Amino acid sequence: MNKEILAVVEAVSNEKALPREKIFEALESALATATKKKYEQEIDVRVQIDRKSGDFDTFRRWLVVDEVTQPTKEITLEAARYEDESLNLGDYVEDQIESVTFDRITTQTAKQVIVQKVREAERAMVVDQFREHEGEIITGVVKKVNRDNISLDLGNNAEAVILREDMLPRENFRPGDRVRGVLYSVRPEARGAQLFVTRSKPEMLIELFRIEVPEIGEEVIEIKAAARDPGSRAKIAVKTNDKRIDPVGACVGMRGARVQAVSTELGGERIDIVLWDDNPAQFVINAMAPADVASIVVDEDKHTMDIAVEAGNLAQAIGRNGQNVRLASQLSGWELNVMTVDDLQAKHQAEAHAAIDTFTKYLDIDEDFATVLVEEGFSTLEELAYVPMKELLEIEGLDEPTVEALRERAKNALATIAQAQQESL
Amino acid sequence: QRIRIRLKAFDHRLIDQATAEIVETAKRTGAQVRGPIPLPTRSERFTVLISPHVNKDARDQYEIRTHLRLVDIVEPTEKTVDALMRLDLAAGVDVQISLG
Amino acid sequence: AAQTRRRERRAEKQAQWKAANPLLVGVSAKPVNRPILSLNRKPKSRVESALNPIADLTVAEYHKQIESNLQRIERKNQRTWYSKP
Amino acid sequence: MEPAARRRARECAVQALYSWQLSQNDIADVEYQFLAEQDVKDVDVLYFRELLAGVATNTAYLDGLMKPYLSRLLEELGQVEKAVLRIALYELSKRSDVPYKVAINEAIELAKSFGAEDSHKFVNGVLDKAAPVIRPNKK
Amino acid sequence: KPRPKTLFEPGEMVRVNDGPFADFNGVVEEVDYEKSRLKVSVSIFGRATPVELDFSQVEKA
RNA sequence: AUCUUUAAAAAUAAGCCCUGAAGAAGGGC
């Protein structure tokens, strides 16, 4: 019996120019799993299937390693040298298991293991398109609008889809028009092939610059980071390979115009063309535009920075509803804090007396120590008291003894108090 | 048969790039290329003050010159027309096409 | 734009907090920055295998064959064999 | 010293040379397609065919002529200026017949009105350093 | 009145259903009865593209 | 119609109030 499953399964197959060499492995893992349950210890088997005569011969499989972990599984290599010397370490020695029929019932685990393999092969060629066009700009004709998502037609009945948060916030749709997108990061989601097309993710703006600017197709200029707000404002960072080329002047055009055309493609999208620097600090100074940066103290180990702005352009440095500080806190890679020059002055006066008070937690003899703290800081216990050459040759006299006193109290203080409070069990 | 293609532009890199794209497309889709030829750079002007009172700024009134080309093609197939249909032409360039 | 004026109306209630908490200032939280640099560029090899003229016309749609072959077999035994198990 | 039909013939020549530079076909094919579409018929066609054959059959020589300039500039053209510079390097390396400052000047006044954005200070910076080229006499 | 009548694409008003510019439209600004062509202005990419099309290739507004 | 010296900068938009120091967080009309 069945006797028809092979005819109908050579009827389904050869649909992507490979008839038998996926269903070889499907019958391998299909029939190899069936004898796992009837003999209840550890029995791994492999079959050799032939399509011509219909008879199938299964073969006994034993694992060849050096020691016996769980019994009877291991041929224990020196016995594998006797039956066939061509068999080596890594493959299994063939022994015959007596079974020749088409099969007894089950005969059905075959049927939907076939239904499984055609679906994951479908998934494989859907992934093959997901390699061929990620990421391109392609566009399609609207078919259906199911009140949260929408349906496209990209040509040859290639149906796509667009989410809610994946749009510009106020879009209108008519069944028939075409919208462009980059595509995307793959979910299946169910058994099928769906394609979420984006217009609010940054890669839409980026690939619009790629078609718009031809120097990206010439590798003259080089774009680094992109921060957006899908209907209000964007900041995108460019550099150039040759120092004579101006990437900003290449990205604006005449008269507007590239940021004007890509802007009118995405509504009221403001585009800030900004230069990328190798310096982490100066790229933020470029990125706060159109602010006038007074001074920035860059704080390491947390990716944080502090920004002060003089006068008048405070709400333009932060932006309306924090948009300049948010998009600027999205472009670079370091967290930003925008304050005044007087809040920066009170910040330094706060951190100085704060370091003084956290050093009043230590032993803290008379006021000359705090004078050293105001003059030469070196806060947070001198960064484990490791500074070179008498704090780079400061003069109060006191060459050897007093610096050994402050390094002795420093190392003993951080040792005792840091092991007392900072070190956990 | 023609399609005839005439293109207008403000920047020369986009129209040289774009005509290279169209000629490369017509060469790949199995058809023959007629042209392309250039035409003289027609100058124009249009006074745009984005600001108040008339000429206290002493700067230019946003003048520009205009480049334009033309290219033809004879005996195409359906692969050519859905090929040029699927092709996403860049913005800022005007396409004055024909067909017949 | 217009509204959010009411927190600038409350700048004195901010000033007593800056008098009480001087080491804290205005802050801005910080999301998904790490893959927006790598997905900003191929730089060019994606529109070299995609190559804006030539490789949407040459390589247009390739799982469109497999999806028509997929459902039509479990459809095909029922529509073909007949309703008359 | 020449009729104006030669001055119109170079104006047709940049258009016929642009078509071979872009279409990448055979030269006899592209002039065989070119000669039936222009309707300003004051063209000295012997110099026209002589120049199209001249830049047609040539070579590793003319990029040797512009090679001391593309050692100074990045190797990026400038397509109408590629046409005007290649025809200028052919007529400055073939034409002992016609004079030498005419075909520079009407092709730089032609190249300013027909080429890219500025395109005349560029070529005026080219052909002065291209005057000490292999032709030694400055006749 | 759920208010739809489309049958309509970004041009104003026709229906093209052949060749490249199918499911698009425009106006025949210059009618050629002798040549049997209709110069229809397709609004692709936010831009008019006046293309000459046949009577059977379009549907008249 | 026989010399004119190495290519050009853009946003003018998001309604009204309460809690909160918030341009962190949420509510109302």
Curated annotation (Swiss-Prot), chain A:
State the function annotated in the UniProt record.
Answer: Part of the processive rRNA transcription and antitermination complex (rrnTAC). The complex forms an RNA-chaperone ring around the RNA exit tunnel of RNA polymerase (RNAP). It supports rapid transcription and antitermination of rRNA operons, cotranscriptional rRNA folding, and annealing of distal rRNA regions to allow correct ribosome biogenesis. Participates in both transcription termination and antitermination. Involved in a variety of cellular termination and antitermination processes, such as Rho-dependent transcriptional termination and intrinsic termination.
Q: Where is the KH domain?
A: 230-293, 302-368
Q: Which SUPFAM superfamilies match?
A: Nucleic acid-binding proteins, Prokaryotic type KH domain (KH-domain type II), Rad51 N-terminal domain-like, Transcription factor NusA, N-terminal domain
Write down the InterPro entries for this protein, in alphabetical order: DNA_repair_Rad51/TF_NusA_a-hlx, KH_dom-like_a/b, KH_dom_NusA-like, KH_sf_prok-type, NA-bd_OB-fold, NusA_bac, NusA_N_sf, S1_domain
Gene Ontology terms: biological process: DNA-templated transcription termination; protein complex oligomerization; regulation of DNA-templated transcription elongation; ribosome biogenesis; transcription antitermination
Instruction: Please state where this protein is localized.
Output: Cytoplasm
Question: Which keywords has UniProt assigned to this entry?
Answer: Cytoplasm, Host-virus interaction, Repeat, Ribosome biogenesis, RNA-binding, Stress response, Transcription, Transcription antitermination, Transcription regulation, Transcription termination
Task: List the cysteine pairs that form cystine.
Answer: none
Curated annotation (Swiss-Prot), chain B:
Which terms are listed as keywords in the entry? Answer: Ribonucleoprotein, Ribosomal protein, Ribosome biogenesis, RNA-binding, Transcription, Transcription antitermination, Transcription regulation
- In its keyword annotation, does this UniProt entry include Transmembrane? no
What InterPro entries would the database entry show? Answer: Ribosomal_uS10 (IPR001848), Ribosomal_uS10_CS (IPR018268), Ribosomal_uS10_dom (IPR027486), Ribosomal_uS10_dom_sf (IPR036838)
SMART domains found in the cross-reference section: Ribosomal_S10
Q: Name one Pfam family in it.
A: Ribosomal_S10
Q: Does the keyword Transcription regulation apply?
A: yes
Q: Name one GO biological process term.
A: transcription antitermination
Query: What molecular functions are annotated in GO for this chain?
Result: structural constituent of ribosome; transcription antitermination factor activity, RNA binding; tRNA binding
Among the entry's GO cellular component annotations, what is one?
cytoplasm
**Could you say which protein family the record assigns here?**
Belongs to the universal ribosomal protein uS10 family.
Functional description taken from the UniProt entry: Involved in the binding of tRNA to the ribosomes. Part of the processive rRNA transcription and antitermination complex (rrnTAC). The complex forms an RNA-chaperone ring around the RNA exit tunnel of RNA polymerase (RNAP). It supports rapid transcription and antitermination of rRNA operons, cotranscriptional rRNA folding, and annealing of distal rRNA regions to allow correct ribosome biogenesis. In complex with NusB is involved in the regulation of ribosomal RNA (rRNA) biosynthesis by transcriptional antitermination.
Q: Know the name of this protein?
A: Small ribosomal subunit protein uS10
From Swiss-Prot, chain D:
Record key words, sorted: Ribosome biogenesis, RNA-binding, Transcription, Transcription antitermination, Transcription regulation
Any one Pfam family match given in the protein's UniProt record, by short name = NusB
Q: Which InterPro entries match?
A: NusB-like_sf, NusB_fam, NusB_RsmB_TIM44
Offer a single GO CC term for the protein. Answer: transcription elongation factor complex
Q: Name one GO molecular function term.
A: RNA binding
In a knockout, what does one observe?
Inactivation of the gene causes cold-sensitive cell growth.
Q: Which domain of life is it from?
A: Bacteria
GO process terms (BP): DNA-templated transcription termination; regulation of DNA-templated transcription elongation; ribosome biogenesis; transcription antitermination
Provide the domain comment. The N-terminal region functions as an arginine-rich RNA-binding motif (ARM).
Q: What does this protein do?
A: Part of the processive rRNA transcription and antitermination complex (rrnTAC). The complex forms an RNA-chaperone ring around the RNA exit tunnel of RNA polymerase (RNAP). It supports rapid transcription and antitermination of rRNA operons, cotranscriptional rRNA folding, and annealing of distal rRNA regions to allow correct ribosome biogenesis. Involved in transcription antitermination. Required for transcription of ribosomal RNA (rRNA) genes. Binds specifically to the boxA antiterminator sequence of the ribosomal RNA (rrn) operons.
Family assignment? Belongs to the NusB family.
Q: Which HAMAP family match?
A: NusB
Protein's recorded name: Transcription antitermination protein NusB
Q: Name its species.
A: Escherichia coli (strain K12)
Curated annotation (Swiss-Prot), chain E:
Residue ranges constituting the KOW domain according to the UniProt record:
10-41
Q: Which domain of life is it from?
A: Bacteria
Copy the domain comment: The N-terminal domain interacts with RNAP and the C-terminal domain binds either to Rho or to RpsJ (NusE). These domains are separated by a flexible linker.
Q: How does it assemble?
A: Monomer. Interacts with the transcription termination factor Rho and with RNAP. One NusG monomer forms a stable complex with a Rho hexamer. Binds directly, but weakly, to the core enzyme of RNAP. Also interacts with RpsJ (NusE). The rRNA transcription and antitermination complex (rrnTAC) consists of RNAP, NusA, NusB, NusE (rpsJ), NusG, SubB, ribosomal protein S4, DNA and precursor rRNA; S4 is more flexible than other subunits.
Similarity annotation: Belongs to the NusG family.
- Job of this protein: Part of the processive rRNA transcription and antitermination complex (rrnTAC). The complex forms an RNA-chaperone ring around the RNA exit tunnel of RNA polymerase (RNAP). It supports rapid transcription and antitermination of rRNA operons, cotranscriptional rRNA folding, and annealing of distal rRNA regions to allow correct ribosome biogenesis. Participates in transcription elongation, termination and antitermination. In the absence of Rho, increases the rate of transcription elongation by the RNAP, probably by partially suppressing pausing.
Q: What is this protein called?
A: Transcription termination/antitermination protein NusG
